[PDB]
Amino acid sequence: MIIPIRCFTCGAVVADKWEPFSNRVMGGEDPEKVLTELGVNRYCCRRMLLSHVNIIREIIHYTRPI
Amino acid sequence: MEIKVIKEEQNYLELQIDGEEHTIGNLLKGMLLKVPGVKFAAYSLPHPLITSITIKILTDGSISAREALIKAIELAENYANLFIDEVKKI
């Protein structure tokens, strides 16, 4: 739904690098270069960002009333 | 931790330690293997779901097994203190 706070494999924090990465990649930059500039060097942490699906944006339109 | 003796002699000791795991067991086995007079030394973790280890020491009789264990603990303490002293000045 929303980006995890930490990488699943190691305990590195990845949630604060999601907005810069996604904003710059849809701006036309190379994903590998953006990831290397952000400091994400291990592929365990790179799969966290390269495979995230932002579903909370769709879900906020159908939140349970309670 | 809570310890108890399974079998003790002058040249043999089987000690069970509750609340410990690989971090202390491997260190103690490695320290024991360099104590002069120890013939065999090993540690066992009977089940990975339980936090408990067993130490097994066999000596030639020139030194007691308990004395060898205490000497190994002293060696580990010296190494830890030296590491603390040397990390503060890097």
Binding site: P4, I5, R6, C7, F8, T9, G11, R64, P65, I66 | -
Partner: protein
């Protein structure tokens, strides 16, 4: 297979399970008898005082309440066929949290109540996983 416990503690493969419960205030044609949703009193099929501790003043539990197996979610008494207790309880050995309460009407005009209960599932020894290659 062997799985990482630290990965699971960081949120990997966690899941939630949902279950639904429903009632309907049936209005009998014979004699103009009908059911009512209300906290059951000392009636024919009473279960115990502590099983109705979670119902509100209208006979239905409230969201964000922890329930255990056997707890009553909707209180209901039926016309005699004295009044009988026909409440609906949580199933045996299934804890959870009340997730949603819905009150509406059917085509006839009977009250319809739906309660959703959610249960958190954390991966453990004994759970099944598969790949896209049949493993």
């Amino acid at each position: 297979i062997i799985m990482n416990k630290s990965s699971i503690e960081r949120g990997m493969y966690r899941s939630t399970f949902f279950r639904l419960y429903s009632t309907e205030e049936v209005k009998y044609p014979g004699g103009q008898e009908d059911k009512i949703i209300t906290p059951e009193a000392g009636v024919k099929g009473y279960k115990g005082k502590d099983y109705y501790r979670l119902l509100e003043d209208n006979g239905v539990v409230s969201p964000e309440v922890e329930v255990k197996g056997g707890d009553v979610l909707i209180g209901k008494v039926s016309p005699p066929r004295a009044k009988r207790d026909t409440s609906i309880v949580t199933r045996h050995g299934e804890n959870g949290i009340v997730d949603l309460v819905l009150i509406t009407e059917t085509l006839e005009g009977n009250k319809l109540v739906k309660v959703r209960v959610r249960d958190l599932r954390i991966p453990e020894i004994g759970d099944k996983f598969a790949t896209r290659h049949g493993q």
